[PDB]
Amino acid sequence: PILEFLEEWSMENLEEISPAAIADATKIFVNGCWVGIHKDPEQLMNTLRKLRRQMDIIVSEVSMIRDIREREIRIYTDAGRICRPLLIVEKQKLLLKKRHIDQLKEREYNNYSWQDLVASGVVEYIDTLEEETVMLAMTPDDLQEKEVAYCSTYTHCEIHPSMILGVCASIIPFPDHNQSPRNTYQSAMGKQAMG
Amino acid sequence: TVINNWLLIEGHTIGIGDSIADSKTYQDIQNTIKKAKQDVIEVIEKAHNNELEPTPGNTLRQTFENQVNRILNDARDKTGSSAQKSLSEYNNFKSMVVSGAKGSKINISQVIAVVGQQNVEGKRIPFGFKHRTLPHFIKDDYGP
Amino acid sequence: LAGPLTPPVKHFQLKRKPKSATLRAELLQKSTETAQQ
Amino acid sequence: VGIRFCQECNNMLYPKEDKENRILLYACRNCDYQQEADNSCIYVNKITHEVDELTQIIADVSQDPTLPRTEDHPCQKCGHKEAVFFQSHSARAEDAMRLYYVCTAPHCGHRWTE
Amino acid sequence: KDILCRLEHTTLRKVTANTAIYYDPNPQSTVVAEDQEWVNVYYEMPDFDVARISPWLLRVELDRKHMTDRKLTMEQIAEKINAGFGDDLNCIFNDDNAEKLVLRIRIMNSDDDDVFLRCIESNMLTDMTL
Amino acid sequence: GAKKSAIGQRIVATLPYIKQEVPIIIVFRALGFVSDRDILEHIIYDFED
Amino acid sequence: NLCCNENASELVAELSTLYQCIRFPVVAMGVLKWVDWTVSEPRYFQLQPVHLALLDEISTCHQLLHPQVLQLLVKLFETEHSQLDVMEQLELKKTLLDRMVHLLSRGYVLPVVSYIRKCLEKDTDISLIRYFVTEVLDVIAPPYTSDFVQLFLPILENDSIADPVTEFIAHCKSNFI
Amino acid sequence: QKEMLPHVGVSDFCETKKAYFLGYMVHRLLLAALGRRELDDRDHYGNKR
Ligand SMILES: [Zn+2]
Ligand SMILES: [Zn+2]
């Protein structure tokens, strides 16, 4: 379906071009297969992010990565890649509004689910390759807020920093007040506990 | 035997209150930290403007890295000395370090004032991402 | 108190002045740049 | 040095000398087609290789969200405030920490260094 | 540091700036005017080209900063090259006072003819010790 | 030798089920591309570098 | 306010005010003692300096404070530095001798050259002394005095490395026996 | 046709696509030789599955 979308749009196939224009265009890869080139990559990236946030043609595990310095767009829909959710930020503002949280509070007897937040394009899955092309915000309450700006272009914001922890390391109270070898020791030992 | 049986009468501990310094001490530590941050910013903008000149037998990156390294080192040492000055006579950390039975002055400076610079291979944290240590920072940043 | 002062015993002619005056000029124009801020 | 292919079979033209006229002739091989060469120099390589990074700068980097943006260096073609500044950070490098600036205005990719 | 300079292994690659195989079949009128001025000063003495000289020019320009750093003069480098290659390389050097430190190499009068100069420069860049 | 170093560094490819490597232009010739300009057009997307 | 601010990075900005205030001699003495306590502290050197230019201004203005600045500089010339690289220490001492030459330009030649001859014959590297005499021979011009050659000539035979040098040898040999 | 670049294809006319892919591979090899693009890291987790 991604290739169908590209054929619908102005994606120039390799066999259908002279080589000379390749330097004046951006290469397009699909799971490591060069399919062709494109002239205005920014428009294509905007459209692809729009469609993934709308889940029209693209399921929300396909990662799109635009390397400007090499003029390349790599798209991966294969298995084995690892991603995590991240909130989307535009105009230095969260797309997550209080009405979304209100809909979340009534989850039972409402049938509003996480998949609606995925469907509304407020939270999107990002993989480690695409993370390279992200200016991420730790916390929205200070970093996106106006200040003597460290950065003024934040695309994504983390839901909560504590989710970097592991399943058996998350049980540590105040893990950021301990020498990290002690955190590894506790992670090892908690699996050995009795209960 | 005799020292333990006396220690029952005396007793020894370690508490949160043993890890507290004066508000003046924290303020002085924070002033030193902001001073070091501003100095590192000065060195960064000097290197950016091609105003930092390399030392003999060292490239510009080596000169900049050594300068910022020693800035953080003496800032950490000054904060540690200030923390050591703030300790009481009843501070159990000082009891355990002066006796030498456990810990060190570096450990007290770590717990109370500044954990300090982390290192891999003897250098600061490398750019695992392209020109970035983590996504939360901007590209081509060399701050502490 | 001590009356007039004896000028320094001149031992030579300065065909060129030391570079500290050049450093003075550079530091002065940098001070002007700061005052511009 | 100007690199040129054969006009008959598109293989590399190799320089050669004619002892009669004493002029460089870009002669092909496996096709015996000859051409008048004029550079008087077959090969140059700068071992200094202090190349201008502005050749390798690409104006599209104005679109990146991760690069730091300065508002204190107006452009020279349009005077646009916001400019994206960064370090080239290639090989033949890691001794020049200079900042290369790209004008952030659309369709004005004026690039410079300071 | 002077003694230190006499210990660190120096080669042509470390001190050279760039190289160019200019064609120049006529030694009198060289293809580069910049070459031609001091060449008229130097080929004013027609020496080792009166019999014949190669029709290939190898013009190498060297960094002044490394030469001042390593205390070298162009004359001793020319003597080292001559010791390395005998008559095989006629080396004609510009006076060591110009902006660029230039040196021309041609082949012996008794003499590949063009790729052999690539062999010469590739061998001389690293293997030669100054 | 004195001539391989003269020309300079070369590029090879060690193919699967082929113990010995081969040069790249040989592989491009094997894919039916004889024009070296066409071969570089697959590699060097400009010709002003 | 400037010396007690200590946040100070504004020193480059306050330089004109610093010099006009230094025109008062007591202010110059205060700046001298402040610079002494500042630079004399350990680990002061993490900068590509400026306080030494303040000492240059102090020596330029008031001749009476000439013995004081030298008494500081020689102290800074004999202090040993550990965390500074040896080449960095050498360049630091070269800067200190540049300040010594600036002081010498103001007519305080004899005690400075006497200390130089002392620390030669009594330690320091010959390179720094060669650099100092090169700087002195840069700006010097004839004519001279008997005591000046008495202090400056006998140091001038222990080395033979470099033409103002041979010019001075000819002048002093002909005129100043 | 088969054992080299299977993911590109095995058809008769994807030989041109395979040629372009090989040209891109050696192009990036050239860029690493000139350092126009940096070297890749085996431990960069984006190269993992
Ligand atoms: Zn041809
Ligand atoms: Zn502009």
Distance, CA of B130 to CA of B138 (rounded, Å): 11
Distance, CA of G13 to CA of C27 (rounded, Å): 9
Question: Taking Cα atoms as reference points, which of G159, D89, A17 lies closest to residue B132?
Answer: D89
Residue D111 and residue D102 in contact, taking contact as beta carbons nearer than 8 Å: yes
Task: Tell me whether residue E58 is exposed, middle or buried, using C-beta atoms within 10 angstroms of its C-beta: 0 to 12, 13 to 18, 19 or more.
Answer: buried
- Chain F contact present for D9, CB below 8 A: yes
| Tokens coding A178 | 């301990």
Residue count (chain D): 114
3-class DSSP string for B17-80: HHHCCCHHHHHHHHHHHHHHHHHHHHHHHHHHCCCCCCCCCCCHHHHHHHHHHHHHHHHHHHHH
Residue B95 and residue B103 in contact, taking contact as beta carbons nearer than 8 Å: no
Nearest-Cα distance to chain A for B136, in Å, is 5
Q: What is the dihedral of CA C16, C22, C24, C27, to 10 degrees?
A: 180
Distance, CA of A27 to CA of A65 (rounded, Å): 12
Please name every residue paired with D100 in a beta bridge, in sequence order, or none if there are none: D86, D113
| Ligand nearest to the backbone CA of D14 | 1
Distance, CA of C20 to CA of G124 (rounded, Å): 25
Residue B60 and residue D95 in contact, taking contact as beta carbons nearer than 8 Å: yes
Distance, CA of E50 to CA of E58 (rounded, Å): 19
- Give the Å distance between the CA of F35 and the centre of ligand 1: 7
* DSSP type of residue A104: H
The amino acid present at E111, given as its one-letter code, is D
- Chain D contact present for B62, CB below 8 A: no
DSSP C1-35: ---S-PPP---S--SS--THHHHHHHHHHHHHHHH
Binding residues of D for Zn(2+), as ranges, are 6, 9, 28, 31, 75, 78, 103, 108
Distance, CA of G153 to CA of G131 (rounded, Å): 16
3-state DSSP assignment of residue E124 = helix
Domain boundaries, chain D: 1-45, 46-114
Distance, CA of F28 to CA of F42 (rounded, Å): 9
Question: Taking Cα atoms as reference points, which of H24, H18, H19, H20 lies closest to residue H37?
Answer: H24
Question: Taking Cα atoms as reference points, which of E38, E4, E7, E130 lies closest to residue E79?
Answer: E130
In a mutational test of the A interface, the residue from H13, H15, H21 whose CB has the highest number of chain A CBs within 10 Å is H21
* DSSP type of residue D63: G
| Chain F 2-41, residues with CB within 8 Å of chain D CB atoms | 34-38
3-state DSSP assignment of residue A88 = strand
| Cβ neighbours, 10 Å, residue B17 | 11
| Ligand nearest to the backbone CA of D109 | 2
3-class DSSP string for chain A: CHHHHHHHCCCEEHHHCCHHHHHHCEEEEECCEEEEEECCHHHHHHHHHHHHHHCCCCCCCCEEEEECCCCEEEEECCCCCCEEEEEEEECCEECCCHHHHHHHHCCCCCCCCHHHHHHCCCEEEEEHHHHCCCCEECCCCCCCCCCCCCCCCCCEECCCHHHHCCCCCCCCCCHHHCCHHHHHHHHHHHCCCCC
Distance, CA of E51 to CA of E62 (rounded, Å): 29
Residue corresponding to tokens 């303040």: G54
Residues of A with a Cβ under 8 Å from any H Cβ are 14-15, 27, 31-34, 69-70, 78-82, 127-129, 132
Residue corresponding to tokens 């460290």: A150
Distance, CA of E11 to CA of E126 (rounded, Å): 6
| Tokens coding A58 | 């693209």
CA angle A138, A143, A146 (to 5 degrees): 165
Which resolution, in Å, applies to this structure? 3.5
Question: Taking Cα atoms as reference points, which of D50, D41, D38 lies closest to residue D98?
Answer: D50
Query: Hey, are the CB atoms on A153 and D60 less than 8 Å from each other?
Result: no
Task: Tell me whether residue E24 is exposed, middle or buried, using C-beta atoms within 10 angstroms of its C-beta: 0 to 12, 13 to 18, 19 or more.
Answer: buried
Residue corresponding to tokens 């013995």: G67
Distance, CA of A23 to CA of A11 (rounded, Å): 15
Residues 6+ apart with CB under 8 A from H45: A82, A128
- Give the Å distance between the CA of B85 and the centre of ligand 2: 55
Query: Hey, are the CB atoms on D10 and F38 less than 8 Å from each other?
Result: yes
Nearest-Cα distance to chain C for G43, in Å, is 24
User: Domains of chain E, with CATH numbers?
Assistant: 2-130 (3.30.1360.140)
Distance, CA of E17 to CA of E66 (rounded, Å): 10
User: Half-sphere exposure (CA, 13 Å, Cβ side) for G78?
Assistant: 12
C abuts B (3+ Cβ pairs < 8 Å): no
Nearest-Cα distance to chain A for B56, in Å, is 34
CA angle B118, B124, B126 (to 5 degrees): 120
- Give the Å distance between the CA of D56 and the centre of ligand 2: 18
Query: Hey, are the CB atoms on E17 and D48 less than 8 Å from each other?
Result: yes
Distance, CA of G51 to CA of G66 (rounded, Å): 16
Distance, CA of A181 to CA of A176 (rounded, Å): 12
**Which H helix or E strand runs over A83?**
strand A83-90
Q: What is the dihedral of CA E122, E126, F2, F7, to 10 degrees?
A: -30
**Which H helix or E strand runs over A38?**
strand A33-38
Residues 6+ apart with CB under 8 A from A107: A113
Minimum CA–CA partner of A26 in chain D: D60
Residue corresponding to tokens 């050197």: G45
3-state DSSP assignment of residue E90 = strand
Task: Tell me whether residue D63 is exposed, middle or buried, using C-beta atoms within 10 angstroms of its C-beta: 0 to 12, 13 to 18, 19 or more.
Answer: middle
Alpha helices per DSSP H over D43-108: 53-56
Distance, CA of A24 to CA of B139 (rounded, Å): 26
Chains touching C by CB (3 or more pairs below 8 Å): G
| Tokens coding A156 | 């994504």
Residues of F with a Cβ under 8 Å from any E Cβ are 2-3, 5-8
CA angle E129, F1, F3 (to 5 degrees): 95
Distance, CA of A35 to CA of G171 (rounded, Å): 85
Determine how β-strand A26-30 pairs with β-strand A72-76.
parallel
Question: Taking Cα atoms as reference points, which of B138, B128, B92, B140 lies closest to residue B112?
Answer: B92
CA angle G152, G156, G160 (to 5 degrees): 160
Distance, CA of D49 to CA of D51 (rounded, Å): 5
Q: What is the dihedral of CA B18, B19, B25, B26, to 10 degrees?
A: -150
Distance, CA of E95 to CA of D92 (rounded, Å): 31
Minimum CA–CA partner of F9 in chain E: E122
Residues 6+ apart with CB under 8 A from A141: none
Q: Out of H15, H18, H27, whose CB is closest to F43?
A: H27
Distance, CA of A115 to CA of A118 (rounded, Å): 5
Question: Taking Cα atoms as reference points, which of A172, C8, B138 lies closest to residue G108?
Answer: C8
Q: Does residue G143 have a cis peptide bond before it, meaning omega lies within 30 degrees of 0?
A: yes
Residues 6+ apart with CB under 8 A from G151: G109, G110, G113, G114, G117
| Cβ neighbours, 10 Å, residue D28 | 21
Scored b (16 or more CB within 10 A) or e, E92-130 reads bbbebeeeebbbbbbbbeeeeebebbbbbbbbbbeebee
Percentages of chain A per state (helix, strand, coil), in multiples of 5 = 35, 20, 45
G contacts of C31 (beta carbons < 8 Å):
12-16
| Tokens coding C30 | 């940098």
Please name every residue paired with D112 in a beta bridge, in sequence order, or none if there are none: D101
The amino acid present at G86, given as its one-letter code, is V
- Give the Å distance between the CA of E19 and the centre of ligand 1: 29
Residue corresponding to tokens 């090969």: D43
Question: Taking Cα atoms as reference points, which of E33, E23, E77, E25 lies closest to residue E49?
Answer: E25
Question: Taking Cα atoms as reference points, which of B129, B38, B36 lies closest to residue B82?
Answer: B36
* Phi, psi (degrees; rounded to nearest 5) at F5: -65, -30
Distance, CA of E44 to CA of A82 (rounded, Å): 75
Residue A2 and residue A76 in contact, taking contact as beta carbons nearer than 8 Å: no
F contacts of H20 (beta carbons < 8 Å):
42
Distance, CA of F6 to CA of E116 (rounded, Å): 8
Determine how β-strand F22-23 pairs with β-strand E101-107.
unpaired
B contacts of G88 (beta carbons < 8 Å):
55
* Phi, psi (degrees; rounded to nearest 5) at E71: 60, 15
* Phi, psi (degrees; rounded to nearest 5) at A38: -150, 150
Domain D46-114: state its class. mainly beta
| Tokens coding G170 | 């000819």
| Tokens coding D99 | 């900042």
**Which H helix or E strand runs over E40?**
helix E33-42
Query: Hey, are the CB atoms on H35 and D92 less than 8 Å from each other?
Result: yes
Residue E56 and residue E106 in contact, taking contact as beta carbons nearer than 8 Å: yes
Chains touching A by CB (3 or more pairs below 8 Å): B, D, F, H
* Phi, psi (degrees; rounded to nearest 5) at C2: -100, 10
Distance, CA of E85 to CA of E108 (rounded, Å): 10
| Tokens coding G62 | 């008031």
Question: What residues pack around ion ligand 2 (CB closer than 5 A)?
Answer: D 75, 77-78, 80, 103, 105, 108, 110
Binding residues of D, as ranges, are 6, 9, 28, 31, 75, 78, 103, 108
- Give the Å distance between the CA of D59 and the centre of ligand 2: 11
Minimum CA–CA partner of A69 in chain H: H37
Residue D27 and residue D13 in contact, taking contact as beta carbons nearer than 8 Å: yes
In a mutational test of the A interface, the residue from B38, B110, B129, B136 whose CB has the highest number of chain A CBs within 10 Å is B136
Residue B42 and residue B71 in contact, taking contact as beta carbons nearer than 8 Å: no
Residue A24 and residue A5 in contact, taking contact as beta carbons nearer than 8 Å: no
Residues 6+ apart with CB under 8 A from A36: A6, A11, A12, A13, A14, A16, A17, A28
* DSSP type of residue D84: E
Residue E48 and residue D66 in contact, taking contact as beta carbons nearer than 8 Å: no
D contacts of E16 (beta carbons < 8 Å):
47
Residues 6+ apart with CB under 8 A from A172: A165, A178, A183, A186, A187
Question: Taking Cα atoms as reference points, which of G170, G77, G172, G62 lies closest to residue G131?
Answer: G77
* DSSP type of residue F10: -
Q: Listing from the earlier edge strand, what are the strands of the sheet with A12-13?
A: A12-13, A33-38, A26-30, A72-76, A63-67
Q: Out of A68, A134, A151, whose CB is closest to D63?
A: A68
Minimum CA–CA partner of G54 in chain C: C24
Q: How far is CA A145 from the centre of its chain?
A: 21
Distance, CA of B45 to CA of B143 (rounded, Å): 11
Residue corresponding to tokens 């700087």: G135
Q: Out of A137, A138, A151, whose CB is closest to B138?
A: A151
Alpha helices per DSSP H over E54-111: 64-69, 74-85
Alpha helices per DSSP H over chain E: 2-5, 12-15, 33-42, 64-69, 74-85, 115-126
Nearest-Cα distance to chain D for A2, in Å, is 24
Question: Taking Cα atoms as reference points, which of H1, H37, H28, H31 lies closest to residue H17?
Answer: H1
| Tokens coding E121 | 């420069």
Residue C18 and residue G101 in contact, taking contact as beta carbons nearer than 8 Å: yes
Q: What is the number of helices (H) and of strands (E) in chain F?
A: 3, 2
Q: How far apart are the first and last CA of chain C?
A: 45
Distance, CA of A104 to CA of A117 (rounded, Å): 9
In a mutational test of the B interface, the residue from G43, G88, G90, G91 whose CB has the highest number of chain B CBs within 10 Å is G43
- Give the Å distance between the CA of D29 and the centre of ligand 1: 8
Residue corresponding to tokens 């390799």: A14
* Phi, psi (degrees; rounded to nearest 5) at B46: -65, -45
Nearest-Cα distance to chain F for E117, in Å, is 8
Scored b (16 or more CB within 10 A) or e, C1-37 reads eeeeeeeeeebbeeeeebbbeebbeebeeebeeeeee
Distance, CA of D16 to CA of D31 (rounded, Å): 15
Residues 6+ apart with CB under 8 A from F6: E115, E116, E118, E119, E122
Question: Taking Cα atoms as reference points, which of F20, E65, G65, E129 lies closest to residue D50?
Answer: E65
Q: What is the dihedral of CA D54, D58, D63, D66, to 10 degrees?
A: -60
The experimental method, as deposited, was cryo-EM
- Chain A contact present for H49, CB below 8 A: yes
**Which H helix or E strand runs over G101?**
helix G86-105
CA angle D102, D106, D107 (to 5 degrees): 85
Q: Listing from the earlier edge strand, what are the strands of the sheet with D69-70?
A: D69-70, D83-86, D100-103, D111-113
| Cβ neighbours, 10 Å, residue B99 | 9
